[PDB]
Amino acid sequence: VQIVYAXKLA
């Protein structure tokens, strides 16, 4: 999965 927090875990 794509992660945005601004930072792939997918």
Place this chain on the structure above:
Amino acid sequence: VQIVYAXKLA
């Protein structure tokens, strides 16, 4: 802060 996980916490 913007959150992407696919979902503002800012």
Place this chain on the structure above:
Amino acid sequence: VQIVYAXKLA
């Protein structure tokens, strides 16, 4: 939902 990134969006 609980968010940990270390920071409730729930």
Place this chain on the structure above:
Amino acid sequence: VQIVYAXKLA
């Protein structure tokens, strides 16, 4: 970094 969203990116 540890990620909790409930799912290490570290």
